[PDB]
Design a protein around this nucleic acid. Structure first.
Lengths: 78, 93, 107, 96, 96, 80, 103, 90
DNA sequence: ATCGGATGTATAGATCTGACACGTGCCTGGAGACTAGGGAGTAATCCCCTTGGCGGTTAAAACGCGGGGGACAGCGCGTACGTGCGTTTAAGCGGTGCTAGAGCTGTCTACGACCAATTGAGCGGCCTCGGCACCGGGATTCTCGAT
DNA sequence: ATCGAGAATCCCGGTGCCGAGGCCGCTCAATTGGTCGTAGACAGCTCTAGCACCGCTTAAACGCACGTACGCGCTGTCCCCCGCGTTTTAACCGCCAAGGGGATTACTCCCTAGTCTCCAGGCACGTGTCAGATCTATACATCCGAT
């Protein structure tokens, strides 16, 4: 039940960085749902890479490879 | 020069899936393109998996992980089951 | 010793020797294991059968005994998993799935 | 008694978070959410701190881009307030 | 005389052109345009007929997908007609 | 050749919109569609011609077009 | 004696040749391919670093941070095209505001 | 193994009086690795497509023309051949 | 329009401090010389498939004219969402132990590359017919003017 | 909520044809059977970083009021896009002919893998030190309420 940890002010700050001036009340649930779907998709591949390497910890390179897989290449971690 | 294709193999699969259904040349070429695309996708992902773990070979474990990465949802579960069945039957001659 | 093809030893219809040869001469790795061509041929055979099942069903729904690219396109776009697999793929002579937005329909 | 007109402080903090380069989400709730999501795939699973940090960076970047597309769809419909229909349209056009 | 109302004949076209799989763009104008465009990169170019066929198929599929996204944007704007700004928003969100 | 982009006539754009499920079309859609089709065609044909030059060929084959499309993420099936 | 010095470059021709060999890209690798690829990498790196240093100077700083790299990439028409699907960690975002939201 | 020393040497060639942070150095290393793998993969596919087994400067040139955008490619090829021109002579 | 007050950044100036750039030892990965062999450059040849031209049919495109219906502007209502203040909460931070597991090392056995017969599955070319297209003709269905 | 005329589409029937399929001959790539070298499987060790815990501090989240401005529905206007009929026009199909260049083979030579020897370029490792993050005071860009 930690999806509520993504609070309303955090989503407002993300929208502010996105250039959003006004936010409806139902945005905060849709954003949590979208973030949950994105995190599930990334973590599934990260755990797949970890399992294939016969490891019990998710290294940063696993997340980097998983993100590069989905077309979301990330610089700064290897 | 003799060209190679999966036409006979797709045709064999069709005769055990729909025994009285044919397939046109255009559709057969599309199926060949499908098989080539998925072969190259799975083999490239298996090559990346072998490179990441500093491994010099592509085993059935690399192909299994590549299948669990490329294929979504229940298609991946059934493909993994089919591949494991085939490898077990092969190792049991 | 009678020659027994690896596909028959694995129960598959796709070739195992051909997939092994393509893996060896595809510049994927320095070495290729014995069970990798068997696994890959099984996976490719499964996917081919999965698409051909729905394509034949679509062809039968149109009172056709042959499969045309339209039937393949209908089969792939009607199944969610296959459509996700081939979402970035264009099929020649496939057309589009018939979808009309509800707003455009007559009042 | 000094009160700002609605929208002035909202146009502020936009410039602040365009200029700043922080994480915008508390680290511990995100880490707990990551662990809760990952426990569905493999139990007793450990995470490197850098791995969770990379996950956070990717999540914020994706959400920010999604909110820019949502804003574009909102102004497209002659509006300023973003509704979830804008998010749905952006995700559908993006192919997600 | 008999005149169908403006809504219906457009809908019959939608059904007709969704059921079938013909090209909908004439062969010769598209081929001539392809050769015009290719003159910029290399003079005296030979084109294989299958190459022009593939170019036509890909171009028409791209245009049909773009028109689907355009119609989605037009409906999102509480509208029925598509306008250039709809295509522009669709291409902006798609990443072009 | 001169202005063959006008060969993508208004009826053709209308038919493409109809297959895409568009009911009513504005007058300015046709020019925008011609521009977008032109840009996409140059993007694909540049890569196809590059593949043709690298093969030391004077003929743009269908497989070159297929490779150019796959490079852009289109992955056309059928031809080759 | 070094091939990089022999070619007038700063990136290592020998290391790029070794990585081309180990990468399973092809059975054989030409002698000039590592030289060409090292030259391309050096040019691209120099372009990124020049634009990032300009951004750092415009921010009155004498050190390049990921924010400067992000500004350099996003403010150039072609570098943004090359790295369209790339996320810079702690790079931030390009400051812009839709004109309709302005009062 | 990284490109830190080479990126720093290039930085002193282009900006003699500025430095680089460690995180920006890691991002530069990631950029170099990404571009290297992109060009090398496209060169390998170019070699495979034409039934060749050797990656030469022609394959790298074609891969650069394919990957990089227009003007940014035009200088890059102009750099690459130049290096080969210098490398072959000596 | 214009002024004044009150916020919220600019601007300058110290003040630490900890990453950053600079030396050191070394070692392992690059350089230099030399050889074998096969991959690719170069010539020559065949034929196919690409291009250019011409003529006739006619489907499709262009053009012009109603007419209605849909985009767009303008108003008003009301409610949802900002702004801000007070209160609550749990994140951040700084220390500590503790040990699970990630990484490195040293045998050693099995497994994949490699090479020489051996031959059967798969490809090229050839009839061969039946599944689908084309063309009439009728029935049924959808739309829209009307009440 | 119904009736009926006109236009569109679907199905039944007859006819034709050319593309999928079966088949035969013939290769050359898959199979069998051996060896050899080295890749990773596995046991062992280390040490490090991931996890858990606990107290303190305070920044951030949550809740509640209030005003207001923006979303949304309604209504009038006009203009522009759609349907339809009529007149070009060039797409399309069929045929014919010429030739450029795309596949092929044969030959050869030189370019790259491979090995041995040797050295210095770059990577841990350590360390001084100034670029910059933070704090504090003054200055003024901006926004909003009267006037």
């Amino acid at each position: 039940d930690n999806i509520q940890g993504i609070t309303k002010p955090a989503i407002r700050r993300l929208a502010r960085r996105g250039g959003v001036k006004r936010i409806s009340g139902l945005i905060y649930e849709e954003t949590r749902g979208v973030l949950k779907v994105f995190l599930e998709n990334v973590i599934r591949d990260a755990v797949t890479y970890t399992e294939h390497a016969k490891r019990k910890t998710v290294t940063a390179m696993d997340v980097v490879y998983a993100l590069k897989r989905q077309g979301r290449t990330l610089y700064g971690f290897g | 020069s003799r060209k190679e294709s999966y036409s006979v193999y797709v045709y064999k699969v069709l005769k055990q899936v729909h025994p009285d259904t044919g397939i046109s040349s255009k559709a057969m070429g599309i199926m060949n393109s499908f098989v080539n695309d998925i072969f190259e996708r799975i083999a490239g992902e298996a090559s990346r998996l072998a490179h990441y773990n500093k491994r010099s070979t592509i085993t059935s474990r690399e192909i299994q992980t590549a299948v669990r990465l490329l294929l979504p949802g229940e298609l991946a579960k059934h493909a993994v089951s089919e591949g494991t069945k085939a490898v077990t039957k092969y190792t049991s001659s | 010793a009678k020659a027994k093809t690896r596909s028959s030893r694995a129960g598959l219809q796709f070739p195992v020797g051909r997939v092994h040869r393509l893996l060896r001469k595809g510049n994927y790795a320095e070495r290729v294991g014995a069970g990798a061509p068997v696994y890959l041929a099984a996976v490719l055979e499964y996917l081919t059968a999965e698409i051909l099942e729905l394509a034949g069903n679509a062809a039968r729904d149109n009172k056709k005994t042959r499969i045309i690219p339209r039937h393949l396109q209908l089969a792939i776009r009607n199944d969610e998993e296959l459509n996700k697999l081939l979402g970035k793929v264009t099929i020649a002579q496939g057309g589009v799935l018939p979808n009309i937005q509800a707003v455009l329909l007559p009042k | 008694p000094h009160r700002y007109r609605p929208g002035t402080v909202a146009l502020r903090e936009i410039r602040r978070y365009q200029k700043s380069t922080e994480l915008l989400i508390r680290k511990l709730p995100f880490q707990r959410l990551v662990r809760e999501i990952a426990q569905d795939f493999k139990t007793d699973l450990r995470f490197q701190s850098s791995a969770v940090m990379a996950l956070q960076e990717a999540s914020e970047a994706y959400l920010v881009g999604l909110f820019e597309d949502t804003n574009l769809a909102a102004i497209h419909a002659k509006r300023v307030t973003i509704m979830p229909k804008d998010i749905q349209l952006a995700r559908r056009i993006r192919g997600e």
